Amino acid sequence: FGSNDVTTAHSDYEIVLEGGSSSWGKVKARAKVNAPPASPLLPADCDVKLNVKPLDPAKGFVRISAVFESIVDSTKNKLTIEADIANETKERRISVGEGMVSVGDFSHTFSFEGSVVNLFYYRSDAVRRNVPNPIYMQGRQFHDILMKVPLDNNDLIDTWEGTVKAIGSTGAFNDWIRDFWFIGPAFTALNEGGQRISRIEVNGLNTESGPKGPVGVSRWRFSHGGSGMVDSISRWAELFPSDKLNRPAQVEAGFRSDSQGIEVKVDGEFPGVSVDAGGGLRRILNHPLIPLVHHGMVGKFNNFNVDAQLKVVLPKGYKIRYAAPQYRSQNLEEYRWSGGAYARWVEHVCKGGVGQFEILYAQ
Amino acid sequence: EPVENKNQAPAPGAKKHYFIIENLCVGCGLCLDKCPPKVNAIGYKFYGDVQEGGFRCYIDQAACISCSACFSGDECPSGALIEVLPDGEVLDFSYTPPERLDFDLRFLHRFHRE
Amino acid sequence: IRRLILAFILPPAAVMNKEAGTIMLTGILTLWGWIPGVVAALIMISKEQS
Amino acid sequence: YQIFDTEKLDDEQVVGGHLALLGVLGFIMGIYYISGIQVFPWGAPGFHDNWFYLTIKPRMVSLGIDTYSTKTADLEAAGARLLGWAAFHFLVGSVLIFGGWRHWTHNLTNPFTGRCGNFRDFRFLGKFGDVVFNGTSAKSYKEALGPHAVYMSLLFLGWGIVMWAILGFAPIPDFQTINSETFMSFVFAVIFFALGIYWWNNPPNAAIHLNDDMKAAFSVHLTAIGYINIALGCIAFVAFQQPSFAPYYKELDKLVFYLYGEPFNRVSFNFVEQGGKVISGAKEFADFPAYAILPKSGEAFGMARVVTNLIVFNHIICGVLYVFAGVYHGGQYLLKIQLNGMYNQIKSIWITKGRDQEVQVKILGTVMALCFATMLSVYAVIVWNTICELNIFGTNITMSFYWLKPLPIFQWMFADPSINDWVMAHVITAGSLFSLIALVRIAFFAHTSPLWDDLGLKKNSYSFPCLGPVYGGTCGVSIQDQLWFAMLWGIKGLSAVCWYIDGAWIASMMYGVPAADAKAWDSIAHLHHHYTSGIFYYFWTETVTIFSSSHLSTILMIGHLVWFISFAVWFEDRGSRLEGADIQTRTIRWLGKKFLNRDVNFRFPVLTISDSKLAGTFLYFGGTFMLVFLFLANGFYQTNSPLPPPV
Amino acid sequence: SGPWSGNAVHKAEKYFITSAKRDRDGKLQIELVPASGRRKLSPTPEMIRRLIDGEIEIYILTTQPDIAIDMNKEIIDMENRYVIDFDKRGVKWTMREIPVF
């Protein structure tokens, strides 16, 4: 079989759904890969907790929260972000948030009031009329951020002074900043993910006094165009299911990468899992392609064999007609995919594949 | 095409200033045996009631010769045996294991459910 | 119904959901007092999950 | 004792060492075969009976290489056959040692062509490797498992051919003859061939090994092979007692065995060894030449069960020791990976699932609670049976656990189901649990223990005898010390095995004693077989016959000496011995100088506590089991005639 | 799973206060270093949070260039028990090499 030196990747996935018109879903995903990660700082572990609650249902000011704890080469890192997000218009979105990023001993707290405008390059009705499941939707995003950071430590003050010097001394700051904040292979992910980031435009960054001392206030906009591969652009309404959020949604993920492999645990309960295709049929939502390609960036490094078992737990009286690749088992409401075509598809998408998994299920 | 260079790769087959924290020493002496016989910088200091932990370890810095035998041995169980680097940093061990964020991976369906 | 019958033949397979210590205990129970004692173990634990 | 450590040796060195040891072992086999030649091919009388050849004589006669026939004729033929097979073993072992030297020295150059093959890249046997392997295991033991399975398949096939043609046992399905061993030799070929192919195409993964794992893989496979040995011992005990094996093991009893060291025809003091030698004095038993080793019937000696017990206990002792050693070497690997920090980086259940200290504590606590329960139950049963049979506190045998037979669903395992078999099973479980306490301590508490993580201490050196009297004493806390304690604890389960297989009544300490109701067990319990006397009186009954042998008596004294020498090192005496040895050095110095002008400049050496524990456990085990050998080599001495009631 | 990460003898990762200098006169010269000895950190507010939470354990050696006695907050009612702030507590490791032969 070409080569005999193949490692093993054991994976279990679980998509429990809710009945009715609800798009809610409990998604669990455990994995264990006996393959070396691609982290130059290898003993990298992370624990992510993203919990979103609804506030002001009329205004949609849903408060999302994110806690990324991590330990990379014995370096302890943490990033907390709270943000009231709101779907102002079908194109606009407004967020007011705070946060705190800590690394080892260093730490700083920030706030922001950012507006994102996701403009599609076309809204023609021909494509919608004929194509039933549009995926590659060409578009562009405009972020306008108003970040603020109390300059407490000398690290913050020195960084602010350096940036103030740079923005006025070098006219190519708007270009090379992209090289900066796409650190490492992230820059590659721009070209191989179909996303082009335009030069930033600083409306003005200027320090001002705050309640905890000086506050560096940076007001800058930037742009982010997606050829269609970008799930954050092509699927924008489906990205933010605020109208479908009544119960708190929680996603606790984590990995434990090391020199010998990657352990992954994900638990989640969130909307947007089920999408009405039309005619009463529903789908497990289209797979975002950016995760697939960005992982295939670190997927084609070792030859591996996958033991992947997907378990779809549909509601009480919902059939699963036309689920290609087909399942292996079935308990009259609990369908299992394992081996055969599904394992090939898992190896396909674990290595950068963006193929389809159309789990169309009835009512 | 055919013109080539030639080569053969037969792969195919076909300063230190070691100290002891008297607070944490348990007086095992595993570091004393490593000290060179004549140096004997490391010595035993007794408070009383050996079983109560009175006996402890001390490095006479005057006698020490920075040979690293005591600390490089990886023999200190308590971590009292420390090394202060020339710039200055206390090392409780030759290499501490990296810090990790751990969790028990229990699978969902096949191996270790829940 | 699959879990309980698999348990009556393979109790530790039934407690596989439980912790590795419980699984090892159920395996030992299969080894000593096979079925009655270990079937007791599996029924206790599974009914407790209920 | 660490010169041939796994780290010090690479894979090719291990291949060569195992090959050279296989050759040495083949030489040993030839030695035993020749020792088995009762009559030489030239006509003269041959070697006496050795346990080394009486252990393999059943198997050899099974293969027709030896014969139980008793005439000088065809025993000369059996001797010639044994000589031929011993010569074959000798030459093949010479070749194996040559290959082992080449692999150990890495000089894998053909003496004819000179081509230096590569351990990393080599076609196996020529074209067969191309047909099957398509190219060797580029690296990895995982890719080697399939090739080794194919090698074992070829070994099975070769044994089938050898027994079919050389030893004349055709492949026949029926499992009542050696013929099936040919049949199955082919079966297990295909299996261990096909599986090999599978494991060649689909390799297995346990990532803990495969990486720096000669010690890790060695530990796992040594534990596995220890359980293989235990299973082989059980299978040997069951099968060798089955009728199908009677032609080869039960017919020992019909033979008379002249064994070295057995009673020798004694001679009066006024004895002269000239001519007939009769005039000077009188030999003990006439008709046998003076000093000749007198015959011993296998019927009285029970040589069938003696040889069965020796083989079974050999495999059981080897397997228990291998389990303990595998857990110990795995603990050494665990400690290494804990020190270097790979422990948390291992991504396999065999390491990850017990990563938490809470689960380790719960596992060891469950083992300890089960051990307490079972030991207390069995010991209460045994001591109560002793209280009853000895009629202590006014008791009598009627109050003993004679009713506590194994349940009817478990009496198939036992010929004569009684309380003895119940105590055997539960004592085996309890001894396994006891030794498992230490084995689990090695497995989990190799680098740090909950007491020690609370006490702020870590186990680094994997052999440190202690950390001192801190916290009241830290003796024997290394994984090596836990291995020693595991061995000294498994001494008792292994004893129970010996005493069960030699016919002892282990349900009471004083069965067969001439006191009170000790001899009433056979009536109250309705036993068929008259078990050899109980745990304390078994010593006496077996020593009736150990004492009758000069050789067994010598073993008794030597093993007892070896055993009690162990306390000089195991006891908390090392410092006393060091002080006394300093006094010895000074005494030698000044006494010699006064007595002889030459100076000494030499010191008496005193073992470290680590070496002290090592030697002490070695001596303890050696004495204990060199004496268990006397228990198993005196004779079965368990008759099938129950003793009537004492009154 | 916590005893096998870092040194197994310290439940809370230990940080020795190696270097501190009065010349900068701010006492920011306090340079905490973990027992691993790979991060010359500083007493930031996040380090304060870690110390109060018990995740870390700041310690001081006796044999050193003096860190700051009564210049870095000190409690001397009993034997000295240095504190970064009254709520903090830098437990001083005692090191008797000179007093004893």
Ligand code: BCL
């Ligand atoms: C990732 C691809 C795009 C992009 C796509 C989007 C999209 C699309 C949106 C934003 C939004 C925001 N972006 Mg952006 N964003 C980009 C890069 C940036 C950069 C930068 C690195 O320079 C900055 C400063 C920002 C700034 C911001 C804020 C103004 C705003 C709110 C963020 C927040 O609350 O997150 C809180 C932090 C998290 C939720 C953590 C996890 C983030 C990931 C990407 C989401 C995974 C969701 C998961 C699968 C499901 C979770 C379910 C749970 C139940 C919640 N973006 C890149 C170029 N960004 C939002 C906006 O419109 O605000 C007005 C929004 O909807």
Ligand code: BCL
């Ligand atoms: C060079 C490419 C071809 C062409 C190839 C295709 C293909 C193939 C498809 C469409 C499709 C569409 N075409 Mg067209 N189309 C052409 C010319 C046009 C003109 C025009 C006045 O010339 C118009 C109004 C349209 C209109 C439309 C849309 C209604 C429709 C769906 C959206 C889509 O993305 O459009 C794509 C439109 C463009 C490719 C070009 C539109 C040109 C505009 C009007 C004027 C010049 C713009 C710029 C200066 C130069 C051209 C840049 C190109 C993007 C390379 N086409 C040119 C001549 N078009 C899709 C479909 O069937 O939807 C149901 C589809 O799959």
Ligand code: BCL
């Ligand atoms: C600030 C970020 C943006 C945003 C940006 C995105 C982007 C970008 C994506 C989603 C996607 C999804 N988001 Mg969102 N989304 C926001 C707000 C929300 C809200 C809400 C009401 O506030 C909810 C409930 C959701 C829920 C969802 C689902 C509809 C969908 C994932 C389906 C799936 O099964 O996930 C199952 C997923 C899991 C099993 C694994 C989750 C792993 C972790 C916890 C999240 C990813 C982390 C990332 C890789 C690392 C950190 C990123 C940043 C650098 C900090 N988002 C905010 C406003 N969302 C995806 C989708 O399908 O788009 C169509 C997608 O591509």
Ligand code: BCL
């Ligand atoms: C005793 C209880 C345990 C045991 C406890 C230990 C301990 C404790 C240690 C080892 C060590 C080792 N053990 Mg061990 N180990 C056991 C069983 C085994 C078996 C097996 C039979 O399957 C094997 C292959 C090994 C393999 C090994 C090596 C990995 C390693 C180095 C040995 C060597 O170089 O020593 C060199 C010496 C030997 C060759 C053995 C001594 C025998 C002599 C040389 C034999 C010939 C002379 C004569 C016949 C008998 C001796 C007495 C005479 C009076 C001279 N162990 C037994 C059952 N093992 C050591 C190591 O370094 O660990 C990392 C170590 O410290």
Ligand code: BCL
């Ligand atoms: C039956 C299958 C057993 C097994 C049985 C044995 C036995 C038995 C011995 C070894 C020996 C060794 N084994 Mg092993 N071995 C197995 C699987 C392994 C695996 C593996 C799975 O990959 C590894 C890496 C090893 C590793 C090793 C080395 C430490 C060593 C071979 C090097 C050599 O000979 O040195 C060169 C050394 C010499 C040739 C000198 C040998 C001196 C004398 C003749 C033997 C010394 C040891 C002792 C007397 C044997 C006692 C057996 C007891 C009676 C129970 N074993 C399994 C578990 N292995 C030998 C060793 O050195 O043990 C310490 C050895 O004797």
Ligand code: BCL
């Ligand atoms: C008893 C003999 C010993 C032995 C002694 C020797 C000697 C002597 C030599 C080698 C040579 C080699 N050995 Mg060797 N070696 C043994 C077992 C092994 C094993 C193993 C299967 O575990 C390995 C990995 C190797 C590895 C190697 C190769 C690197 C090399 C052959 C290159 C190749 O293309 O040859 C193709 C064939 C091989 C891979 C040989 C495989 C081993 C066979 C079983 C040797 C049998 C020799 C015997 C006298 C003939 C009996 C044949 C009957 C059919 C039974 N040997 C056997 C068990 N080895 C040879 C050399 O350098 O070749 C160029 C060489 O001259």
Ligand code: BCL
């Ligand atoms: C079962 C087949 C093999 C086996 C194969 C392996 C393999 C493979 C590995 C070990 C390893 C180890 N083995 Mg082992 N080992 C066996 C027998 C034993 C016995 C014994 C007396 O029975 C003991 C005490 C040990 C001890 C040990 C340690 C030295 C080490 C694990 C340390 C650790 O952190 O574990 C953490 C604690 C655990 C993981 C506890 C849970 C146990 C696991 C999940 C499996 C068994 C339980 C099973 C599910 C029970 C229920 C059903 C029954 C089968 C009927 N092995 C048998 C012979 N062992 C590893 C090592 O490092 O080797 C050097 C290693 O790689």
Ligand code: G2O
């Ligand atoms: C046969 C068994 C024993 C001896 C033989 C002996 C000999 C001996 N011992 Mg011992 N011992 C125990 C057994 C024996 N101990 C037990 C079971 C315990 C458990 C408590 C124990 C404990 C302590 C402590 C705590 C200390 C000592 C010492 C100390 C000595 C140093 C000098 C001296 O005493 O000479 C007086 C002792 C003699 C010279 C004995 C004369 C030889 C003999 C006639 C024959 C030797 C037979 C041989 C051993 C068999 C095989 C040999 C060959 C064929 C391979 C010293 C020669 C200590 C000293 O160094 O201080 C004096 C010390 O502190 N012990």
Ligand code: SF4
């Ligand atoms: S008695 Fe001996 S083994 Fe025990 S702690 Fe003291 S020196 Fe160590």
Ligand SMILES: [Ca+2]
């Ligand atoms: Ca006997």
